[PDB]
Amino acid sequence: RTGGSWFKILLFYVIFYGCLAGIFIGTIQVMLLTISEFKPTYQDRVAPPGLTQIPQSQKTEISFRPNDPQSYESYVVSIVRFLEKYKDLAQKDDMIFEDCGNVPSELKERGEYNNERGERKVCRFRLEWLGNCGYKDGKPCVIIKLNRVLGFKPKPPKNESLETYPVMKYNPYVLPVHCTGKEKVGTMEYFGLGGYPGFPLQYYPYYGKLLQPKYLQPLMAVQFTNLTMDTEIRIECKAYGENIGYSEKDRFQGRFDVKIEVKS
Amino acid sequence: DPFYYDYETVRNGGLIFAALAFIVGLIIILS
Amino acid sequence: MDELKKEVSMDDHKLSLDELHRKYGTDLSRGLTPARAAEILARDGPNALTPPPTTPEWVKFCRQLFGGFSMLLWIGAILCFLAYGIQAATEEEPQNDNLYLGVVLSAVVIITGCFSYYQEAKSSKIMESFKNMVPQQALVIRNGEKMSINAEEVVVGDLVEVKGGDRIPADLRIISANGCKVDNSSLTGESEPQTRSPDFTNENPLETRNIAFFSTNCVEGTARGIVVYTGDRTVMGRIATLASGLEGGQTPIAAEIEHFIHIITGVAVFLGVSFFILSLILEYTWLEAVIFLIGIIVANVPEGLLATVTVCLTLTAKRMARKNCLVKNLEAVETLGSTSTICSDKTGTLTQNRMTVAHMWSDNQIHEADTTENQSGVSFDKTSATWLALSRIAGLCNRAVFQANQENLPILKRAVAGDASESALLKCIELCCGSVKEMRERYTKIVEIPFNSTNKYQLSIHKNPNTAEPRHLLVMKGAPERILDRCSSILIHGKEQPLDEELKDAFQNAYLELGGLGERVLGFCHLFLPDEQFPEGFQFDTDDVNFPLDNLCFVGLISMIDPPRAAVPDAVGKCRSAGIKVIMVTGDHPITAKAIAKGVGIISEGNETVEDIAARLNIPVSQVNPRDAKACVVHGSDLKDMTSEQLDDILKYHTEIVFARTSPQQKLIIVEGCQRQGAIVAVTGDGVNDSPASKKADIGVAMGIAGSDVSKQAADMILLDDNFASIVTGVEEGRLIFDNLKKSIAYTLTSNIPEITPFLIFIIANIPLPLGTVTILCIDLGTDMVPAISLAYEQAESDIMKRQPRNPKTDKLVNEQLISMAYGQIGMIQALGGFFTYFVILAENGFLPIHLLGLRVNWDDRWINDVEDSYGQQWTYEQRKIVEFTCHTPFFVTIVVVQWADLVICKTRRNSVFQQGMKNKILIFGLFEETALAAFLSYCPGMGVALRMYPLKPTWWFCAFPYSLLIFVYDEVRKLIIRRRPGGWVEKETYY
Numbered sequence A: 001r002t003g004g005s006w007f008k009i010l011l012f013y014v015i016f017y018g019c020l021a022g023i024f025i026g027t028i029q030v031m032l033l034t035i036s037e038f039k040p041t042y043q044d045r046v047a048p049p050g051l052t053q054i055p056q057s058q059k060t061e062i063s064f065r066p067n068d069p070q071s072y073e074s075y076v077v078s079i080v081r082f083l084e085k086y087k088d089l090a091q092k093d094d095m096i097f098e099d100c101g102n103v104p105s106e107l108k109e110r111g112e113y114n115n116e117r118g119e120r121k122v123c124r125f126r127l128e129w130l131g132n133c134g135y136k137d138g139k140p141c142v143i144i145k146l147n148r149v150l151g152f153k154p155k156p157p158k159n160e161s162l163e164t165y166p167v168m169k170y171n172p173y174v175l176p177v178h179c180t181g182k183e184k185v186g187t188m189e190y191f192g193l194g195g196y197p198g199f200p201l202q203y204y205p206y207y208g209k210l211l212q213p214k215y216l217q218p219l220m221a222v223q224f225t226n227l228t229m230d231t232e233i234r235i236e237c238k239a240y241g242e243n244i245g246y247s248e249k250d251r252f253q254g255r256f257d258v259k260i261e262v263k264s
Numbered sequence B: 001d002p003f004y005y006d007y008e009t010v011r012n013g014g015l016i017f018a019a020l021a022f023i024v025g026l027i028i029i030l031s
Numbered sequence C: 001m002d003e004l005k006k007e008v009s010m011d012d013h014k015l016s017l018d019e020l021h022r023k024y025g026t027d028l029s030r031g032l033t034p035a036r037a038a039e040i041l042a043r044d045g046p047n048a049l050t051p052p053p054t055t056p057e058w059v060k061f062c063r064q065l066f067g068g069f070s071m072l073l074w075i076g077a078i079l080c081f082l083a084y085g086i087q088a089a090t091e092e093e094p095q096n097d098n099l100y101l102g103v104v105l106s107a108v109v110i111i112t113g114c115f116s117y118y119q120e121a122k123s124s125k126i127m128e129s130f131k132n133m134v135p136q137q138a139l140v141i142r143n144g145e146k147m148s149i150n151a152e153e154v155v156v157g158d159l160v161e162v163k164g165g166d167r168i169p170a171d172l173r174i175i176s177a178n179g180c181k182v183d184n185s186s187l188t189g190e191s192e193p194q195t196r197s198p199d200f201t202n203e204n205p206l207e208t209r210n211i212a213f214f215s216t217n218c219v220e221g222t223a224r225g226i227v228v229y230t231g232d233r234t235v236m237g238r239i240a241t242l243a244s245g246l247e248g249g250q251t252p253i254a255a256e257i258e259h260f261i262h263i264i265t266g267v268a269v270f271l272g273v274s275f276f277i278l279s280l281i282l283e284y285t286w287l288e289a290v291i292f293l294i295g296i297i298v299a300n301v302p303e304g305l306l307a308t309v310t311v312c313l314t315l316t317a318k319r320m321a322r323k324n325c326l327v328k329n330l331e332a333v334e335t336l337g338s339t340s341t342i343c344s345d346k347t348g349t350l351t352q353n354r355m356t357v358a359h360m361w362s363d364n365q366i367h368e369a370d371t372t373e374n375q376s377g378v379s380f381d382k383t384s385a386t387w388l389a390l391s392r393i394a395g396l397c398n399r400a401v402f403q404a405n406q407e408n409l410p411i412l413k414r415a416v417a418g419d420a421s422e423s424a425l426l427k428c429i430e431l432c433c434g435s436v437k438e439m440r441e442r443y444t445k446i447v448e449i450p451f452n453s454t455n456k457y458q459l460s461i462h463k464n465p466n467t468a469e470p471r472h473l474l475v476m477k478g479a480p481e482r483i484l485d486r487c488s489s490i491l492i493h494g495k496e497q498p499l500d501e502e503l504k505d506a507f508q509n510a511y512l513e514l515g516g517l518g519e520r521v522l523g524f525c526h527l528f529l530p531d532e533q534f535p536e537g538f539q540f541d542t543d544d545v546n547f548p549l550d551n552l553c554f555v556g557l558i559s560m561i562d563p564p565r566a567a568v569p570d571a572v573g574k575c576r577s578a579g580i581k582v583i584m585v586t587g588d589h590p591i592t593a594k595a596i597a598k599g600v601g602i603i604s605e606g607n608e609t610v611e612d613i614a615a616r617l618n619i620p621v622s623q624v625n626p627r628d629a630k631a632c633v634v635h636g637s638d639l640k641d642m643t644s645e646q647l648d649d650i651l652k653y654h655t656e657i658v659f660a661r662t663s664p665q666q667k668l669i670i671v672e673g674c675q676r677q678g679a680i681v682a683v684t685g686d687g688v689n690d691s692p693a694s695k696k697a698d699i700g701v702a703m704g705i706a707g708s709d710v711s712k713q714a715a716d717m718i719l720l721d722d723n724f725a726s727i728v729t730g731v732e733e734g735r736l737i738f739d740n741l742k743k744s745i746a747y748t749l750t751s752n753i754p755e756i757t758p759f760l761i762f763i764i765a766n767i768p769l770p771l772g773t774v775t776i777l778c779i780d781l782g783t784d785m786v787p788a789i790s791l792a793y794e795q796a797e798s799d800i801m802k803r804q805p806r807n808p809k810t811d812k813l814v815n816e817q818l819i820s821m822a823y824g825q826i827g828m829i830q831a832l833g834g835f836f837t838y839f840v841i842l843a844e845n846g847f848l849p850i851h852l853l854g855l856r857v858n859w860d861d862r863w864i865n866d867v868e869d870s871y872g873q874q875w876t877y878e879q880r881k882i883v884e885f886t887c888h889t890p891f892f893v894t895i896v897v898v899q900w901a902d903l904v905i906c907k908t909r910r911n912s913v914f915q916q917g918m919k920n921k922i923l924i925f926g927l928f929e930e931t932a933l934a935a936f937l938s939y940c941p942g943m944g945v946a947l948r949m950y951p952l953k954p955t956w957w958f959c960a961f962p963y964s965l966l967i968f969v970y971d972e973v974r975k976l977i978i979r980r981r982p983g984g985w986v987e988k989e990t991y992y
Ligand SMILES: C[C@@H]1O[C@@H](O[C@H]2C[C@@H](O)[C@]3(CO)[C@H]4[C@H](O)C[C@]5(C)[C@@H](C6=CC(=O)OC6)CC[C@]5(O)[C@@H]4CC[C@]3(O)C2)[C@H](O)[C@H](O)[C@H]1O
Pocket: C087, C093, C094, C097, C098, C288, C291, C295, C296, C297, C298, C299, C300, C759, C772, C773, C776, C860
């Protein structure tokens, strides 16, 4: 319990933490000074892209009762949010959109990673491309997505690498997308751009956000119909390509795994 | 493919220098 | 209880030979009946000290968990052993974090124990294989028959016959004794033999000559007495019980330790709860704001500190076993330098307890002999003829002989068959004049008058070896007055000369000078008989006067005393130079006591007692202002009626004190009284009458060889060679290891601030977890284990012997000043270095600082597999995690890089690193290992999983650099200021 010297401590720390805080910020500001606006200095961490799912699955599962309207309001909400973006109303004026090929077209590098030109043009995408996705209760619609990657040029497998059975062969410009779980208790349908079960190589390479605000990435509606309703089923979407890899630890590297159950 | 690191060579390159101080220090303790 | 033992005893030596027999119903010439014998046996018990309650067991391990520190480790590892179960009931996420951490601290306790249990195990055995005491047999008279029996069979009433060589079986009341001396170096601590007569002398059962006390040993002559006290009933016996039956007490070092916790826990709950309220106000349910409070413990409680300190102490103590100083306790290692006042025994401790020829008066000149064990001094003279005529007499008029088979052991250590004085002579001549048996052979003894009680002298008649004047030679020795009373001439420089009243005065000068030095004096003279009144075959009458006894040739005096140790004096001086108060507590007589005192430097030159003054100005006692007497001396007879306030006052106003003729129990009160001042006092004795003082001492210290068993037991330290000078070495090391302990607590606790904050702001700014748990454990026990220990080996930033003993109540081991440096200053710079590396790794990987606020929510979301960076890229769950964990790893490296810096600025306290240079060779190697370790814990094939440690990119390591170097500087500068302004608001604020 010391007195009269309290001001000696206070004044000390004040202008010590004060300068320590100065230096910590100082440096912070400088290392803020050697990284692009346009491109992350390191990307070797996201090497394999990751296939994410719109229906927000608590634990990779979509169990719900057809007989309840609210038994799947949760899966409805989030699937709503992802899609309110792709509105034909959000993207009307060629600024800054471009009605790309109604089908699987070819990619077109829009210059480089500079702000030397304007806002890099952004290919459109119609909510219509995703037929039958109410949403339906019988057989919920589940759309898939590919993770954004600056400079990523997906390269679909050559006609020489393909097994039983990802079809058709859209070697041109499209990333196949099959689904499975033995255990064949399903019936798979895919509502695509062109109708194909794959991504159009007309949307890459994605040019950052800072370079392409309002950019929009492809979608891939995939809902089943004839399925069990008294048991959980284990199905797994998977992407395919040279530029596509998977790991044992990450159960999301270019694939999902969904535990659907339409109990009622 | 500027999306690649030669991690395999820095792992092989650090493990070679942490095994050198491990033995340099064994030269100065056991003197 | 013991209070009964804090008081003088009673006895009945004042009873006539009859009474003592009528009270015990025994016989004086017969001794009681074997029937009355076995009987009085089963009545009380056997004659021995009850089995010492020294039977420990495996359960001892528990004692290693009494230490306040050990408690935290337990309270924590249990408290963090519950966090897992609290969450587990919900979701098994952090099962390696909490669950592991608990087990870790758990096992820690267990090993730390081992280094504490292996200590008091190795020390015992190492001291148990020593000279084992094997009780012998006693000689009793039962039914007029004398026999020998187990000493345990001796009962209160039987006749016991003792001789020269054995020891006192039990407490005796002499009834017969012929020239009987004994050794009271266990009660009075006085080596010089004490005659024993059936006649009572002093009213004090401690001075009477008709009582022999157990545990002693009859030096010479014979005697017989009745047993009045047996077993514990013995005078010295009661002391043993009070010695091994006393309380231990809390050590000094332990005080610092326990106090240190109060401060640690002190903040750990201030932050713990301060951040619990903060968490609430930050939108946190009652299931979280508390699950955090429990959080701020590990971060706040050193896990490796305990195992550190312990390793330190163990080490320092190993450096003392190398200098022949042993210990039984680990805490003791420190006490010796926290000491402010040393209480010392005189005999066996400061001295050697062996009569030795000290001085000689030949050629009207005072000579002085070398008195050390190893004869470190110098010779006096050997040229003068007188010396030879003196050396011959001491060697021939002498009956002492070296025990057989000792040509191996040095002269001063070989046992001798003979009394005190004569052993001394034997040894003294044997040393600087060759074998004495050579003298008793060349000069054959024909007739001699052994030393008579009336005669006061001992003479001999030897056949001269000279082939020229080989005529009967007469030699006698005895009291200086009796010898001079029978002298006509005085061999000076070879040729005889008249006993002038001039030299009958210069002998009266020496005899009173050597005597005043508390030394025993012997006078020597010889005579060359007239070969006319004595033929070649003359027969001498030892019973009648057949030869000349008067008018002999005086040759010289020689004196002897209980010389001190080798370096005892030089040693004591050291401690005084350090500011340690030296106090002699001996049960000896003032005369000799005060003597050895001025000889060892407990009492310096020019200082005086109230009495000394009284003698000089020739005034009464009660006329000298006590305050002018810086020294004094106190007889135990004066203390008996002294109230503690008086002793208090005696210790306050004097600087050089000598409590003499004190009873064991007084030692106790003296020590106590010194402690009552608040001082740290150490007791160093050998005689069993020292235990009660040595066990009550903050730290006791015993004499290995000459020390008795029970003092060794109640003692905290063992000098194996009795080298006092180790003591100095002891306090030095004690003071050195003290500071270096600070420096290590510093280093360690500094590491703490950059371990906590990452988990604090995590909750305040909602950013991903900068530092993971598995990480912290790779510092507090990974890299921050070597450096710390290395700090044990720092030297002194100055001469420490040159400074006063620390004030135990004021200069704590972990004071608030050291807190505000590691916590409020250095750790802070160590923290910022930590975060700098943080934002770097994230930024270069696409997550700017700004965007990092409030991310944790979604970040730690294990569903969102598309969280968006500041570049618009999208990350899965595991991918961004691999960055978090790779953001853990460098925070870990980065720390290490600031522990480079801390480790150096902590190697010193006031001296610049340039001044103290880099002598420490361990501290060096630690950097390399501390580093090599981090490096390894990174680029290890699999560690990425076993410890979620991922490799670091080139540009990674150099993230802390600019900070680490800042630290180095900030401290070097600060210390330069402390040096320039030794006030001060710079030193008394920051100076640990
Ligand atoms: C915001 C918070 O974030 C996640 O949890 C966080 C809090 C809590 O859960 C834990 C585990 O219990 C904490 C724990 O409590 C405290 C720690 C023992 C702490 C230490 C202090 C120390 O001194 O050394 C170690 C540092 C990490 C720690 O080892 C774990 C790390 C995993 C974590 O999981 C992290 C979850 O997502 C959670 O649900 C959400 O509430």
